[PDB]
Amino acid sequence: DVYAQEKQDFVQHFSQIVRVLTEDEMGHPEIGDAIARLKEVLEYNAIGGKYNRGLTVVVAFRELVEPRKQDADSLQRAWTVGWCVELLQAFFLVADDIMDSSLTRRGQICWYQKPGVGLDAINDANLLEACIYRLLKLYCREQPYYLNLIELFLQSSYQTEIGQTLDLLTAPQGNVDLVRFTEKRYKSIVKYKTAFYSFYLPIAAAMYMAGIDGEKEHANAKKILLEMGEFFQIQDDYLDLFGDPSVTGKIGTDIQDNKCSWLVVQCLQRATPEQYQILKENYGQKEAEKVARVKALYEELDLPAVFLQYEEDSYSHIMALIEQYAAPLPPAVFLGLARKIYK
Amino acid sequence: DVYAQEKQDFVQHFSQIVRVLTEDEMGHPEIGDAIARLKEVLEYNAIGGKYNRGLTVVVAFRELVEPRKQDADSLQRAWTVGWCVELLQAFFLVADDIMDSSLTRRGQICWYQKPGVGLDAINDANLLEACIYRLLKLYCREQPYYLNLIELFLQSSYQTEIGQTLDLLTAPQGNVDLVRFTEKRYKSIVKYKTAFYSFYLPIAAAMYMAGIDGEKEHANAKKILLEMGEFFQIQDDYLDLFGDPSVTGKIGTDIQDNKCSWLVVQCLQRATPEQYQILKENYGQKEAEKVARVKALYEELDLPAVFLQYEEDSYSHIMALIEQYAAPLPPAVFLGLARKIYK
Numbered sequence: 231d232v233y234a235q236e237k238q239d240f241v242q243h244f245s246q247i248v249r250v251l252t253e254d255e256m257g258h259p260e261i262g263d264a265i266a267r268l269k270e271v272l273e274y275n276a277i278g279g280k281y282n283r284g285l286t287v288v289v290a291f292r293e294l295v296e297p298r299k300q301d302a303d304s305l306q307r308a309w310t311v312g313w314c315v316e317l318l319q320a321f322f323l324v325a326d327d328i329m330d331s332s333l334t335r336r337g338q339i340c341w342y343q344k345p346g347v348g349l350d351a352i353n354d355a356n357l358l359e360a361c362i363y364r365l366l367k368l369y370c371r372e373q374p375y376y377l378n379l380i381e382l383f384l385q386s387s388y389q390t391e392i393g394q395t396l397d398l399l400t401a402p403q404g405n406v407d408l409v410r411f412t413e414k415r416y417k418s419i420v421k422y423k424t425a426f427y428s429f430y431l432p433i434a435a436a437m438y439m440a441g442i443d444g445e446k447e448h449a450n451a452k453k454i455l456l457e458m459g460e461f462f463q464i465q466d467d468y469l470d471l472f473g474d475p476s477v478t479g480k481i482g483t484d485i486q487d488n489k490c491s492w493l494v495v496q497c498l499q500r501a502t503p504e505q506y507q508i509l510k511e512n513y514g515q516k517e518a519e520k521v522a523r524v525k526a527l528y529e530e531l532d533l534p535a536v537f538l539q540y541e542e543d544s545y546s547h548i549m550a551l552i553e554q555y556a557a558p559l560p561p562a563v564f565l566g567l568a569r570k571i572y573k
Numbered sequence: 574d575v576y577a578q579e580k581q582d583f584v585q586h587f588s589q590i591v592r593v594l595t596e597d598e599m600g601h602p603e604i605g606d607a608i609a610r611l612k613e614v615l616e617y618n619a620i621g622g623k624y625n626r627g628l629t630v631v632v633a634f635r636e637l638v639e640p641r642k643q644d645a646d647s648l649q650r651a652w653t654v655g656w657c658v659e660l661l662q663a664f665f666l667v668a669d670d671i672m673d674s675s676l677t678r679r680g681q682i683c684w685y686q687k688p689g690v691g692l693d694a695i696n697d698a699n700l701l702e703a704c705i706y707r708l709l710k711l712y713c714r715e716q717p718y719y720l721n722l723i724e725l726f727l728q729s730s731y732q733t734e735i736g737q738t739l740d741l742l743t744a745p746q747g748n749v750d751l752v753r754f755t756e757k758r759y760k761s762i763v764k765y766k767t768a769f770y771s772f773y774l775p776i777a778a779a780m781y782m783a784g785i786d787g788e789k790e791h792a793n794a795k796k797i798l799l800e801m802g803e804f805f806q807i808q809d810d811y812l813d814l815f816g817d818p819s820v821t822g823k824i825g826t827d828i829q830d831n832k833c834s835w836l837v838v839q840c841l842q843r844a845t846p847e848q849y850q851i852l853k854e855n856y857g858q859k860e861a862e863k864v865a866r867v868k869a870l871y872e873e874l875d876l877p878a879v880f881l882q883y884e885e886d887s888y889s890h891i892m893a894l895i896e897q898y899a900a901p902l903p904p905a906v907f908l909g910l911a912r913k914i915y916k
């Protein structure tokens with residue numbers, strides 16, 4: 231697989247990414263100690279995940295570009311830009327983990343939870359953000375898509391930040407209100423907090439690198455990718471509760487955390503006044519006796535079937551979008567991504 | 574005064590800055606609630622300070638530009654770019670306040686300390702950062718210095734972030750170590766965390782807007798401004814303990830907070846082994862009986878006189894730099910700034 235294959239070269243390029251970002255220490259040894267911490271920040275936070283968003287940039291670049299323009303440098307820039315997406319993600323996860331008072335990320339202790347870190351991780355998160363642009367300058371300054379990538383990563387940060395503000399306003403840290411749990415809000419949080427940075431940003435970066443800078447091509451790609459974003463999160467929320475924790479490699483947290491999940495949204499859309507009250511109680515509770523009750527109400531409301539139906543219609547919808555908006559790009563750009571997301 | 578005069582127009586432009594940043598709500602009412610919070614973030618965090626860094630951009634722009642090129646739009650962009658510096662500063666202060674577990678900023682409750690905020694202020698700090706670039710795109714996209722300003726604000730964020738990492742490594746939250754309190758470190762923290770963003774960034778922004786984009790002109794300006802930065806912080810640390818709290822409008826916190834202040838650095842440079850131990854005890858302590866002891870040791874070591882001597886040599890040094898590096902810029906750019914900083 232394009233992904234399974236290149237995952238090695240992508241992860242092996244990280245050694246250079248680090249060497250390169252820890253090279254301004256040469257002229258200024260005065261800040262060596264801060265760069266030593268900056269190294270530790272990257273090693274701990276950019277490494278450990280699936281690298282799929284970062285890999286998408288590499289994969290999409292190969293697919294969008296004529297094989298003769300794929301020289302040593304072009305690929306060095308594709309891996310780098312791929313890494314910038316991972317670095318952007320590392321910056322959000324470090325900060326999101328602080329904000330939601332989390333204990334683990336990828337089964338490991340959250341960076342801020344590590345001794346000697348704590349709220350210093352707020353600065354660490356900022357340094358991860360700074361590196362996107364440091365690399366972008368180091369590898370793409372002379373490229374004609376340079377300004378386009380800076381603006382893309384910047385728009386992408388803003389979009390996520392807006393999404394996060396929306397999420398935070400919707401599900402506060404100790405507020406059992408389901409009035410603000412509307413589908414219009416769920417769809418909105420997903421567009422801003424996840425869909426944009428996870429699906430639009432990686433393909434869009436490759437597009438700019440390929441010379442595809444047109445507003446219409448990007449609008450067409452944005453149309454397709456944002457809908458893939460929407461499904462990804464809906465499936466993520468379904469799998470959170472009904473997924474097999476062996477294959478998923480994670481156990482259900484959603485209900486216990488008062489999350490505006492797709493499941494609750496649907497539950498709230500299809501619930502008798504008493505069923506609303508049953509939820510109004512058991513939601514946001516750490517107690518296994520209470521978590522079991524919601525799981526049971528969702529099941530009673532045939533949400534696994536409502537999800538199955540949604541998955542069918544969604545894949546049917548994405549194909550319609552790919553048909554309509556992929557042109558003039560290679561449909562494979564989108565088809566490859568959809569295959570990895572759907573089942 | 575250029576400052577005292579324009580402070581009104583600068584502060585009155587903030588109403589537009591806000592209107593403009595809260596205008597993407599028109600096409601997307603779906604995120605209205607997040608923008609409503611985004612409004613509250615700006616009103617609370619960008620307003621309330623002296624606006625001197627922001628004002629420097631306006632003042633320097635007028636001084637660097639031929640009065641005929643100063644049309645409605647040019648000034649609208651100068652006020653905006655001025656505001657971006659304030660927004661950059663707002664982003665650091667919100668985050669620094671969280672990190673150092675502070676109670677007040679400009680005598681008012683810290684944004685994060687306000688009910689319903691807390692660590693959500695980490696995201697708020699990011700939104701303040703996002704706005705720099707949102708405004709930059711809104712007002713300067715079509716200007717030839719556009720990319721130069723994005724890179725400037727970005728380099729400036731990185732520099733401060735590095736400075737902050739350095740500071741955090743030097744003075745941890747409950748670590749009485751004076752081994753790392755060297756002058757080389759003090760000078761380093763000051764260059765990165767303050768001098769760059771406070772003095773280089775504002776003048777540099779005006780320079781780019783004026784067409785002054787040359788590496789040498791910027792190196793020459795950087796030479797002068799970074800030294801002004803160094804004094805500013807040294808005076809800030811002196812005034813922290815020995816300033817009249819009426820005129821200063823602030824009371825001494827430094828010693829109680831284990832800060833790598835200029836005073837301690839000098840105290841440590843000129844201290845008998847027993848004087849080292851006297852400090853090793855009383856420093857980082859909240860007790861007024863212990864804070865009085867350090868104040869008394871500094872006095873014993875004639876640091877107010879060591880500072881007076883430093884101020885004299887420093888002003889003498891800045892004038893030498895202005896003589897050597899201001900050309901071809903108007904020396905008044907630098908002279909005006911120095912007058913406001915020195916006594």
Ligand SMILES: O=C(O)Cn1c(C(=O)NCP(=O)(O)O)cc2ccc3ccccc3c21
Pocket residue numbers: 280281282283286428429567570571
């Ligand atoms: O990485 C993920 O969370 C999901 N994911 C997966 C995935 O984990 N599939 C299950 P597996 O790794 O066990 O075989 C693949 C893949 C590809 C491209 C992507 C782009 C944006 C966002 C996600 C993406 C993505």
Ligand SMILES: O=C(O)Cn1c(C(=O)NCP(=O)(O)O)cc2ccc3ccccc3c21
Pocket residue numbers: 623624625626629771772910913914
């Ligand atoms: O605003 C400040 O903290 C200091 N400050 C002052 C100042 O407060 N002077 C005392 P005052 O307001 O009571 O008369 C002025 C002035 C000007 C340009 C500056 C540029 C970068 C950084 C600081 C600056 C600056």
